[PDB]
Each structure stands twice: as structure tokens, then as C-alpha cells.
């Protein structure tokens, strides 16, 4: 039930961490 | 209900995969240019 | 409870669907 | 608990604003040059 929602959330955080330093690698990879 | 959380957060993760995908296309873009 | 949950769920996509079109004017940008 | 998934939908929401605002900067960046 509400361990399933956590453990969803706790990957979808993973992919936002993922997704934050491909922005930093871009901003780099730009100035 | 429950179900609609569920879906939700299918969503949630294919617009997740789909944007570390357009990120990526543009990492690689610019690491030629 | 629950209901709560899904209405942060809702609004999280929308961030989600907001940097997409970002993302998608950044390339436009780029090439 | 409940608590732990009220937290975490919080910390998720900080990281899209972050998001959005690492993007935008870029956005503006290019913007220009």
C-alpha cells in the first residue's frame, strides 16, 4: 500500500538526481 | 483510487525517463559542437 | 490521506511537463 | 510513515524547482550567445 508509494517515490527521486547532474554536465558543457 | 496513485506515478516515471532521454540527446548534441 | 498524495502527484507532473518544454526549447536553441 | 512519503513528495518537489531553474538559466544562456 503505502510502502509501495514510498519505494515509487524513492525511485522517482533517483531519476531527479539523474536529471540534475545531466543539467549540470550541460551548463558545463556550454560556459 | 489507490489505482489512480498508481498510474500516476507510472506517469510520473515515463516523463522522468523521457527527460534524462531529451537531456542526454543534448549532452551528446553539444559534446561534438 | 490518500487524496493528498495524488494532489502532490498532480502537481509534480506538472513541474515534470513544464521542464520537458524547457528541454525541448534548449535543443531549438542549440540546433 | 504517511510521514515519511510527506517528506519525500517535498524533497521531490524542491529537486523540480532546482530543476527548473537550472534549465532556465541555460534557456536564458543560450538566450544570448
Same mark, same amino acid.
Given at each position: *500500500?503505502?510502502?509501495? #508509494?514510498?519505494?515509487? $517515490?524513492?525511485? #522517482? $527521486? %533517483?531519476? $531527479?538526481?539523474? #536529471?540534475?547532474?545531466? %543539467?549540470? *554536465?550541460?551548463?558545463?558543457? $556550454?560556459?
Amino acid at each position: *500500500r503505502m510502502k509501495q #508509494i514510498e519505494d515509487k $517515490l524513492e525511485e #522517482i $527521486l %533517483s531519476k $531527479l538526481y539523474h #536529471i540534475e547532474n545531466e %543539467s549540470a *554536465r550541460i551548463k558545463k558543457l $556550454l560556459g
